Amino acid sequence: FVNQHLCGSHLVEALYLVCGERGFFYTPKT
Amino acid sequence: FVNQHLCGSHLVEALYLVCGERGFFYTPKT
Amino acid sequence: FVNQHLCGSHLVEALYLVCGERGFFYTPKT
Amino acid sequence: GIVEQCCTSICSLYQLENYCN
Amino acid sequence: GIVEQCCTSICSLYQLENYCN
Amino acid sequence: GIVEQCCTSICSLYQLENYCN
Amino acid sequence: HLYPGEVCPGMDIRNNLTRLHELENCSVIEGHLQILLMFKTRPEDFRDLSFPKLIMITDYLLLFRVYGLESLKDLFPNLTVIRGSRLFFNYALVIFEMVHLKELGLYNLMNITRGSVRIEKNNELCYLATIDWSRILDSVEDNYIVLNKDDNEECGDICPGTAKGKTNCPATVINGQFVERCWTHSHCQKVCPTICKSHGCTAEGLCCHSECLGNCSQPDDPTKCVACRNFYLDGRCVETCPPPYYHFQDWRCVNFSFCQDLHHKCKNSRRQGCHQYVIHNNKCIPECPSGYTMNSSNLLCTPCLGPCPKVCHLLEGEKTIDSVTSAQELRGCTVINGSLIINIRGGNNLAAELEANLGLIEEISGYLKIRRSYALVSLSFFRKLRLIRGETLEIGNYSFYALDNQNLRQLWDWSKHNLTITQGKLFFHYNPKLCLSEIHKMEEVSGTKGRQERNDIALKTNGDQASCENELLKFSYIRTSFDKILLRWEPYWPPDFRDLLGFMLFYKEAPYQNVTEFDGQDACGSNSWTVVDIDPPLRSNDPKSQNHPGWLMRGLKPWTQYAIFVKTLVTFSDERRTYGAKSDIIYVQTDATNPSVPLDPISVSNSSSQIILKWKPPSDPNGNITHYLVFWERQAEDSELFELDYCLKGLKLPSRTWSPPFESEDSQKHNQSEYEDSAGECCSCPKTDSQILKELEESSFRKTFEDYLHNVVFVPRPS
Amino acid sequence: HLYPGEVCPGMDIRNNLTRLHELENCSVIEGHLQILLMFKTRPEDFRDLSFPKLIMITDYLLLFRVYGLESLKDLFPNLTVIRGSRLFFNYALVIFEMVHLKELGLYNLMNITRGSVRIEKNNELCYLATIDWSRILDSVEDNYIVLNKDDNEECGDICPGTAKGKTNCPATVINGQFVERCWTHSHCQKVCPTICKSHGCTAEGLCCHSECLGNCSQPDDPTKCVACRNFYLDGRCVETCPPPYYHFQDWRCVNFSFCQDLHHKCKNSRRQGCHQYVIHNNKCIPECPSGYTMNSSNLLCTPCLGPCPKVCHLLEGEKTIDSVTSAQELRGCTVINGSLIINIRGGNNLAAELEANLGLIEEISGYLKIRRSYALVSLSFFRKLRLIRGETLEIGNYSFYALDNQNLRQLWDWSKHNLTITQGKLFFHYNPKLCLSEIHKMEEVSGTKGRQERNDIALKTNGDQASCENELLKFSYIRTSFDKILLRWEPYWPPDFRDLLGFMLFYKEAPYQNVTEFDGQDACGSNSWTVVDIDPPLRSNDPKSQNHPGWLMRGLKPWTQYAIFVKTLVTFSDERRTYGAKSDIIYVQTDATNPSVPLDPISVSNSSSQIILKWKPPSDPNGNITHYLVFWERQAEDSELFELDYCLKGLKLPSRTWSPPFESEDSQKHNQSEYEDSAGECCSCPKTDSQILKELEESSFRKTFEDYLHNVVFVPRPS
Amino acid sequence: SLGDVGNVTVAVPTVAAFPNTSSTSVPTSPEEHRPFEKVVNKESLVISGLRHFTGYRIELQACNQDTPEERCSVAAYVSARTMPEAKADDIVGPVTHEIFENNVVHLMWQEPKEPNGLIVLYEVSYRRYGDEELHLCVSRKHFALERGCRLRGLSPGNYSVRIRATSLAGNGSWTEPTYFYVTDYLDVPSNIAK
Amino acid sequence: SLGDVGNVTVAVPTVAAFPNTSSTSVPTSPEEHRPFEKVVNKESLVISGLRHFTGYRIELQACNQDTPEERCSVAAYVSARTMPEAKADDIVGPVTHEIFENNVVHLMWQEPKEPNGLIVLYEVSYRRYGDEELHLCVSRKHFALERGCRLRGLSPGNYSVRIRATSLAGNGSWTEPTYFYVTDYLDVPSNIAK
């Protein structure tokens, strides 16, 4: 993220903060 | 020592060594 | 053989373990 | 996986904003 | 705790920081 | 051939087998 | 109806509130149920509904990163069992990274069908240690409830001892600890008799009957009981359903029309696709086992003539089976078109499940890779493996990449076991308990002899603590004393008799019989290892005598089950083959005598007329036989009496004192302080090097006269 | 000169039955016939030997490790004089460490003007009780005639005068009477008087000329002497040699060509010993000791100012040193132009002597085959070892070779040393327990690439127990005390924020300021260094943390310097690029603090009103000290002293310097209140019963859990 | 324990290699006539035939021979002090003494019935204005030699005796702190003990 | 009690409120300026101004940071006894006697502070001639409370004394059993140049 190499729960928390609410998607039609 | 445990008043000699003048409010149990 | 204190009573056993079918020397030989 | 772009070689903006709004 | 996290457990300054930081 | 010790010295069968009276 | 209908398939609950409307009036789940990423939500936010409608879950239940929902007593209070057909990783219940918890619901659960539980990284929930979970599970080990707030010193997991309502907290022993069977504080969980629990019981002081496994709704009834032990039809438990209703997902009895329609549909929003189920002997199942092919006449499984195995398509894209869930991804397949990698570690020998899933495929395409197995023994899930195509191998042409298989001291039993190597070589490094003479046999039966590399791969790196040798020795004479024994074994040597260098006896105090070779890896106590070389007078068998090859122990403990096995010191040829021998790993002990004082002769006298004693074994065992005789030498008129006359001031070490110490918790306490200041001992002491080689060379003075006479004297010389 | 027969020097005899039959013409022996390595010589073959006659014997005699020799009485008949010119252990005769010398020659000895006779370990030896005692030995006090068969009063002293023959047997006087003294069973001794023992006596007349000795043709002429105690030359005798002729032990003069130019001609093409024989101490010697160099064109050793180095050219240019004394053999030789192979077996930390000796041995011009260096774990203890040439190439055209060597884990450090490579390739392989980048630094300092191949040296293994950590760390903060010291360092983590699992602190007592980096042998607690682990830190926020990685250490004594550092708990993988770091060894001095307590308090005095107190420090060298607080004001005027020890009691208080009011003894040595400070690490187990991998098995397992828990919940679409 | 120095049983209870008799007759066995103590499913066994308020050594050894009692005639040694009770911490004999109000007395605390190892001691310091004075230290050697004490000037009255508390494991006869009278020996006045 | 000055070994006399004043004869005080010495880079310091074989407890301590106070180390209690002057045990101060009215000459031993070191006892071996008057080989407490020494009765004629002052040095008023002339049970000129 900030060092271009992040690996941990901090990655998920930062990713959630990047998008915010209604940020995650997925694909049921597969 | 710190090998397995320190038990006694010596914790005080460690306790003040941890905080320093920063608005410390350590709780020495004796 | 590693140099232990193989003398003394051990000598009797050293005199016995290769014998017994041919008697054995009771006392030390030293 | 996300690790495949962030637990490895450089993790840039596109490697993160792949599913945000 | 304050007198059971280092005496009655493996010592670690992380919990000790909580009593003044 | 007058060796008596075998802990601080050495010996062999032919020195001991005779002494099995 | 007894079991409510309205079955609701599972879905993903992610990132928003008010998504629980798909739980309204739902009986059971058909799929996966996940609750993910509910951050910064009040307890009141998710308490808008509660679902005791749910009874059991077909598959794993997942809870990950949810900060509201302080307990499960107000969303899923009433639940009984969790099906374990499908698994996620070692279990079905995931509770990971919960916050603001202080209680736990799930009132009166009975049994988890397969796996374990997981409640981890939850430093907020308390009262989560003595919960009734053990008997509910099948795998008593492989449990994971750690990073709680009781080992972290933030709350004590206390539960009430009294009968909380109909429930009660019997102190049940698990692994030696008394757990109060409960779910949280101010509540309890009942326990029934073992025979009753074999088929479940009601929470009414009553026991169910057979055909059931949990709580019987109409109590003590076999036909109308909830949580059936077997299949069910229209609200009645059934062991087997006569036609037309066949079994489905191993737990329901459904109509033939339902299975046909399901085959005529797919659950990926398409048609004539996924979820291809067909009839078997009693059950609708997908992908009929080997020896039974499809039947388009009526869309069934029918018995094919000859083998008709089913191959799992893995041509491109690596799919390693490194978990029980990944093992279940390939059920009943016969060929792995891709490469297989095994990295499973820990557990309690989960290979049994591999025997239930694997151990049926016989062609391993590409390359096998058994890497980093910290705990894996008794490989028996590749017995049928006797073929390999080698479609695409790894770098270095090493299609058998075995590495870090610490306790993997067996491969097969060699009952027609074999494997044909079309292409590739064998890699072996760091295999302490993998044998040499069996690896060579495996090499011989796979065309690897000769083409094995002797520039990248060696063998001596392995076998560092145990091995096997088809060459064997026997104990031809034994004479027993109390502290030493004269043992003599067979005079056998390898085919190159003059390559003989000498024998090597390895002895240690193995704790009990039926334990394999360990010496070589252990260098301290707990298999304290000792080794001594041996070279008796006979080097060739031509001169007969009354003393065949043998050795005597330099000294051992009386009546100790020392383990004896041997490995001959030998050279090695160009290409390594079966070389070296041994004898039977025999547990032997000497005679006994007890001149040594039993340790801790604690004065525990309690009567003036009679003497109470406390005996622990001496440092030597001095015989496991418990028969002793007790006498005593008098001590009257001793010089200590009249010299240490204490009839006045001044310490004289006064005569006739009695003060037992009681080392445990009364004097010399144990707060994990090891050293005693009476006389300390070094820990990081100095160290020197090995020095034994100065000693054996002395004996060469009495074994070299004939050598010089045969090698130095008989030289043709001009003098 | 002017002698008959062959004037034969001496040579050794070895490992055969008899090699005296070759002698049929030597009538004069100038050397000394030595016996060596005769471990199996039987007596029966020595009953007859060959020697024509004897004019005189010049050098000493030394007999050593012979099993036979029932008769050595045929070698030296017609004896005239014997003396130890050279002296092995200062004695003319040395019988030591042999057995059963029943009979010998020497039966007409006339005088030994210098050197006594020592006899030892002769179970069989006769007729040493009926021989002249003081007429033959110049130093009677140093006579050691002991352990002989006749000396045990068991061998009948049969001799001539009763039943044997006549061999010119005059009756000499030692005890007033003219005794018919003898030497052996059938021989008699001719002995000159003690009065003129320094001039010689002959049957032809009175005592010979003063320059003569032993025997002469006629007296009053130096020319007529057959043996001169003064320098003999060309027939005549003289007191000193001319400068053209160098001296030889008061007995001969020899032209300089036989000392100077005799050995300079040959470097490797003469089997006599080419050591550049020089002249010093008025005598010709192969080489002179240290402190005496070569300056003249003739190569005569002359003194130099103080001790000076020696450039030694050894025979064959090869010397395999197999012991500390095998290296002391070449002591003083500061530069050696050849191979110095190390195959040293045994010993215990005596290699400090090598640091005095091999720490001066700079160059090894030959192939460097070194192994079995048990004593020195690290090769960084030689202050002069820089040059390694390949003038002699072993097999493989290599100038260096250390393959599959054990009991080594380190090499020479370049922080305070260096080394250079020359003459071709070099092979270094299979010495585990040592990092590999150190060899890369060796290549860098050596230079001259092309002959430093990165395929002929280990860059593939032998380092999977000491990870080469590229990065290094420091101590950003260190807040110390008497023992409690909090060290806090940089919060740098690896790119993965879970692979690092703590920090391994390394420390030991090291007042010195020069230390290598190693770890002694492993015995579950015993190690030269001391090592412990520290829990990993906790993340707080992305840009920076508010809690640095810190650790509190105890046990270190104040005032004392410790060569302490840290390493990172690195999870093993296939790439060392992303591993952690290690701090540099800092000789950190624990601050001078009040628990400094000197020991060995000794009260001595030259008077009663003085007490010159002296002591030794436990760990306080007083470097930072300012003053000593000491008490002499009265603090023993205690009521205990004024109110104790009535004379009615036994004498116990006299001869004491310890009384109640001065007591500070512990109430109980058991750990009760504050004696728990000695709670240290496990010394039965190293730290924990389970070795390291079982922890790593857990650690990585959690990662493979969490990432497996992540890889299913992300990546909604490839697009 | 050993009735004979050899390795046989003589069945002679009158001889036990000690002045006192502790062994009793048993059937003849191939070992010394000794107090055999068999062991079956326990790690503790009593030793009867001792004297009260005493501590003793203990012999122990296990040997193969079980058809006889035991062939072995040696053993390993431990120690154990008996637990005192309310039977010998008091005077095993009476606490009476010989009364004399006739210018002289013989003082003798009676010896134990079973000889103990340590009596409850009472100090003796009866001093006056510089006249014939008696002292006494009470040990086995000292009590045997000095034979108690003998005073002069005997009449009903006060008698000085040193005072100190006694505590071994709870005694049964002690020294009192009172100004001692002589009221015809209830327990304390004439005889300080009890 | 009495603060002192100086940071090196003392040699001048210290006021002790006695006629003969010697240094290191004062009770300790909270003042840190003791007779100690500073570092000389060596673990050896000759000490002067002391008394001839006076008993001295010392707490050996090193120090650092002399600027604020004598910041020093913890105490290790060691007692010093070096080079007894048994010659000086004869007399430092004079000796006299009070002839008590009991046929005893209570010998009073005067001193400025020390008859050759610290008085701890005066060994006496005079208990012969049966039982006689109240004899005390007087200890230091009874010496404090009486300022002398008691003995058994003494008759006219010759009497060999056995009183030697024991300051752990010996030879005070006695070296061998010389006979003094006891005249009329009194008037014994003891310590005849002894």
Side-chain angles (χ1 to χ4, degrees), chain H residues 621-687:
Chain H
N622 303 136
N624 319 277
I625 199 178
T626 307
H627 57 287
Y628 282 92
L629 172 52
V630 188
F631 282 59
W632 290 289
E633 300 172 13
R634 293 291 304 104
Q635 61 188 141
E637 302 183 3
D638 311 340
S639 303
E640 305 302 72
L641 311 195
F642 309 140
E643 307 174 357
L644 180 62
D645 193 72
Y646 298 93
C647 324
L648 300 168
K649 310 181 188 180
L651 295 163
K652 64 188 195 304
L653 179 56
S655 69
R656 292 218 309 171
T657 55
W658 197 242
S659 265
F662 322 109
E663 288 181 10
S664 304
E665 294 290 350
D666 301 329
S667 178
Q668 285 290 307
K669 304 298 190 303
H670 293 336
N671 311 339
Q672 302 295 347
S673 57
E674 275 189 354
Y675 311 129
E676 304 185 4
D677 293 327
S678 300
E681 60 177 0
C682 192
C683 308
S684 62
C685 61
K687 193 169 179 62

Side-chain angles (χ1 to χ4, degrees), chain I residues 72-84:
Chain I
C72 291
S73 298
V74 287
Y77 306 97
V78 299
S79 302
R81 176 56 173 77
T82 59
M83 186 64 177

Side-chain angles (χ1 to χ4, degrees), chain H residues 381 383 413 415-416 508 510-516 561 563 585 587:
Chain H
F381 309 133
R383 314 313 313 168
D413 314 351
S415 54
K416 57 244 173 184
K508 60 171 193 175
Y512 50 82
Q513 293 289 324
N514 301 277
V515 74
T516 66
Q561 307 176 2
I585 283 188
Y587 303 93

Side-chain angles (χ1 to χ4, degrees), chain G residues 416-434:
Chain G
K416 301 296 204 72
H417 287 94
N418 54 88
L419 178 58
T420 302
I421 286 181
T422 55
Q423 294 178 1
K425 298 93 177 182
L426 310 186
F427 185 89
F428 285 105
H429 275 272
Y430 297 93
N431 317 324
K433 306 193 79 170
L434 203 67

